[PDB]
Design a protein around this motif. Sequence first.
Motif, PDB file in Angstrom:
ATOM      1  N   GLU A  84       1.029  -1.289  -0.015  1.00 24.04           N
ATOM      2  CA  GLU A  84      -0.329   0.117  -0.170  1.00 24.04           C
ATOM      3  C   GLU A  84       0.795   0.971  -0.037  1.00 24.04           C
ATOM      4  O   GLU A  84       0.256   2.455  -0.603  1.00 24.04           O
ATOM      5  N   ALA A  85       2.299   1.527   0.469  1.00 21.08           N
ATOM      6  CA  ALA A  85       2.753   2.734   0.441  1.00 21.08           C
ATOM      7  C   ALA A  85       3.138   2.462  -0.244  1.00 21.08           C
ATOM      8  O   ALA A  85       4.264   3.323  -1.829  1.00 21.08           O
ATOM      9  N   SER A  86       3.773   1.316  -1.182  1.00 23.74           N
ATOM     10  CA  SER A  86       3.941   1.042  -3.139  1.00 23.74           C
ATOM     11  C   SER A  86       3.302   1.967  -3.948  1.00 23.74           C
ATOM     12  O   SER A  86       3.956   2.624  -4.135  1.00 23.74           O
ATOM     13  N   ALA A  87       2.687   1.626  -3.689  1.00 22.75           N
ATOM     14  CA  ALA A  87       1.067   2.218  -4.610  1.00 22.75           C
ATOM     15  C   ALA A  87       0.455   3.583  -3.979  1.00 22.75           C
ATOM     16  O   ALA A  87      -0.112   4.142  -4.627  1.00 22.75           O
ATOM     17  N   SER A  88       1.348   4.618  -3.477  1.00 17.65           N
ATOM     18  CA  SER A  88       0.789   6.055  -2.550  1.00 17.65           C
ATOM     19  C   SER A  88       2.247   6.616  -3.004  1.00 17.65           C
ATOM     20  O   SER A  88       2.088   8.258  -3.428  1.00 17.65           O
ATOM     21  N   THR A  89       3.918   5.648  -3.023  1.00 20.42           N
ATOM     22  CA  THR A  89       4.821   6.807  -3.676  1.00 20.42           C
ATOM     23  C   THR A  89       4.919   6.664  -5.024  1.00 20.42           C
ATOM     24  O   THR A  89       4.496   5.484  -5.310  1.00 20.42           O
ATOM     25  N   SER A  90       5.876   7.807  -5.505  1.00 21.50           N
ATOM     26  CA  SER A  90       5.627   7.605  -7.509  1.00 21.50           C
ATOM     27  C   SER A  90       6.779   6.715  -7.315  1.00 21.50           C
ATOM     28  O   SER A  90       7.753   7.000  -7.808  1.00 21.50           O
TER      29      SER A  90
END
Length: 90
Positions: A84-90
Amino acid sequence: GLQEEFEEFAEKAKTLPDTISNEDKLLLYGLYKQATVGPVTTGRPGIFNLKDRYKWDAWKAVEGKSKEEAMADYITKVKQLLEEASASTS
């Protein structure tokens, strides 16, 4: 296999962003203690030791999970937070 993967995502949890919710931190702590120690047998901390009282409550809440069941849920929870953190950052 399961124990070696649980130890792996314990290291990965250290690289989690601090922006994660307080609830998720309590979920991860309860799962970590439940997987390694098992159900809590320590008495509840004092009424004014709140930092340990919330950690104790989160551990108490997952007392029904077995050690291997808690290992798998801990890995699953760390996976969900990493992706989920990987889907929020560029």
